[model samples]
Target: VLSEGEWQLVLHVWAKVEADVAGHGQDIHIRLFKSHPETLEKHDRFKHLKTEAEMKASEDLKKHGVTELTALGAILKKKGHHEAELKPLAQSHATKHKIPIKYLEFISEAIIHVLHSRHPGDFGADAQGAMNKALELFRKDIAAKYKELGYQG
Candidate 1:
C-alpha cells in the first residue's frame, strides 16, 4: 500500500496533471483542488492561487491549446526547467514516492523546449537508456543519503 505521504505525492502528481491540462501549468495548484478540496484545506499551502476557472479549464487544455500558448509556453518552460531539470530534486522526490526510475523514462516531456525543437522522429533506444540512467542515479543518491535503497549501478 502506498503510504499517506506517498498517496499525497500521487495526489500531487495527479493534481499537477490536472493543473497542466487545465491551466497549461499557469496555476499549479488548480489540479490539487480538483482532486482534493477538503485535504487541501488543511494544507492550504500553494505556490499559486487557484481559480475555479483553472480547474474548469483542464478540459479545454486537453482538447485545445490555450489562446495564449506562446506566453503559456514561456511560463511552462520556466516552471518545467525548475521542476524537471533539477535532477537531484527529482531523485529525492522519486525516492520519497518509491517511484521506479522508469518514471523518468519520458524525461524529454519534462523539458518542453527540447521537445519543441525536435521533429517527430523517435529517440528510441537511446531515450530509454537515458531515462534508466536518470532513475538509477536518483536511487543511488537516495540510498547514499537516506539509506532508502541501494540502486544497482
Candidate 2:
C-alpha cells in the first residue's frame, strides 16, 4: 500500500517520464532490450532487433511501443485508479509472448532506469521507492489476471 504522498511521488515521476517518451517511445523499449537481451528472447517478433538505432527504425517496435505508451497513459489518467486497464496488456504479453511476471518486473526496472537517466534532476531515491511500490501494485493486478487466464508464466 502507498501513502497518498507516496502515490503522488510515483505519479510525478511517471508523468515526467511518460511525457519524455512522447516523441521517442522507441527509446524506452530500446533501453529495455539493451539492459536485458534475455527479455527480447521471448519477443518472437523483435528478437532480431539489435541496437537502439535499429529499434528506432523498426516499424513493428514503433507501433508496439506506441500502444504500450498509450496503455500506460490511460492507467495514469486517474492517478492509476484504473489498474484493471492493464489486463489487456498483461494478457497479450502472457499469452502471445509467454512473458513471466519476472520479466514484467524487469520492465518496470528498465522504465525507472530510463527515467533516471533522462531526468536525473527529477528522479532520485524517494521517486525510485515510490515507483517500485506503484509497479508492485501494477504487477500484482496483472499477475492475478495472468493467473486467471491459466498462464503458468
Tell me the lDDT of candidate 2: 0.75
All candidates: TM-score: 0.25, 0.84
lDDT of 2 at 8: 83
* Tens digits of lDDT, candidate 1, 30-127: 33344445423532233233665544445543343333233333323332223243344435444544434433222223322222223123323444
Query: How does candidate 1 fare on TM-score?
Result: 0.25
Global lDDT of model 1: 0.36
Q: Please list all clashing residue pairs in model 2, or write none if there are none.
A: none
Among these predictions, the greatest lDDT belongs to: 2
Model 2 TM-score, all chains together:
0.84
Model 2 clash count equals 0
Question: Which candidate's TM-score is highest?
Answer: 2
lDDT of 2 at 36: 83
Writing each residue's lDDT as its tens digit, candidate 2 over 49-103 gives: 7676777788888888777777776675455576467777777877887889888
Task: Name the 10 consecutive residues with the lowest summed lDDT in model 2.
Answer: 17-26
